[PDB]
């Protein structure tokens, strides 16, 4: 409530609370959201409208990696990308077993990309109609570009999960940023299991004289 600001929009959730690092985009976010939100709000969503924007509370200046999925869990999104508080969603379980395999940590009760220093977990579209991936693509589009471009000014590496969903990601950005497009954790044939993105991200970081990501900070005991 000091590095946190808020702005008023014309549709639910009505207030957007954001960390200072997001300021330069807030003005256009408000205009973009007001023109589409009523269309959006016609359906029940994952996450609920009160949670659409809670990731804007995160600092950007301390981030070196954005881990990005296309949109929220079709059900039970919390507004924090990939978060599954009771460790029940498949993607987060799979990501966690990659990190287990990678780091040698074998007993754990949870994993959350949002508690890892230097990481910002991100959803490209900020909602979907309950049960239906990508159903709100057409509404989010201009916002999604606005927000991901802003993010990519701060991070050294953008990692996107979903070969098909992200095959055109470059077009969506202005200035180049180190970009990795890996398999979705649900991809056929355990391809996600063979995907070495988490380690590749860290070599890329060292090549940009940055500190590698300490993936084990993700675990919950």
């Amino acid at each position: 409530q000091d590095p946190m600001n808020s702005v008023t929009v014309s549709h639910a959730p009505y207030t957007i609370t954001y960390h200072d690092d997001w300021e330069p985009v807030m003005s256009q976010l408000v205009e973009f959201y007001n023109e589409v939100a009523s269309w959006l709000l016609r359906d029940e969503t994952s996450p609920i409208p009160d949670k659409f924007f809670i990731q804007l509370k995160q600092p950007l200046r301390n981030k070196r990696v954005c881990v990005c999925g296309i949109d929220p869990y079709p059900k039970d999104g919390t507004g924090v990308p990939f978060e599954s508080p009771n460790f029940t969603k498949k993607s987060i379980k799979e990501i966690a077993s990659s990190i287990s395999r990678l780091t040698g940590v074998i007993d754990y009760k949870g994993y959350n990309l949002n508690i890892i220093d230097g990481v910002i977990p991100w959803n490209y579209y900020l909602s979907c109609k309950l049960g239906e991936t990508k159903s709100h693509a057409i509404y989010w589009d201009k916002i999604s570009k606005l927000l991901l471009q802003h993010i990519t000014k701060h991070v050294s590496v953008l990692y996107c999960l979903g070969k098909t969903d992200f095959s055109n990601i470059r077009a969506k950005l202005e200035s180049p940023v180190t970009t990795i497009v890996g398999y979705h954790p649900a991809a056929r044939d355990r391809q996600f299991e063979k995907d070495r993105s988490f380690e590749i991200i860290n070599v890329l970081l060292e090549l940009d004289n940055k500190v590698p990501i300490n993936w084990a900070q993700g675990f919950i005991y």
Binding site: S156, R170, P176, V177, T178, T179, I180, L204, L207, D208, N209, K210
Partner: peptide, 9 residues
């Protein structure tokens, strides 16, 4: 590397 990941350090 530049070509595969768009930009590297």
């Amino acid at each position: 590397g530049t070509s595969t990941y768009w930009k590297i350090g």
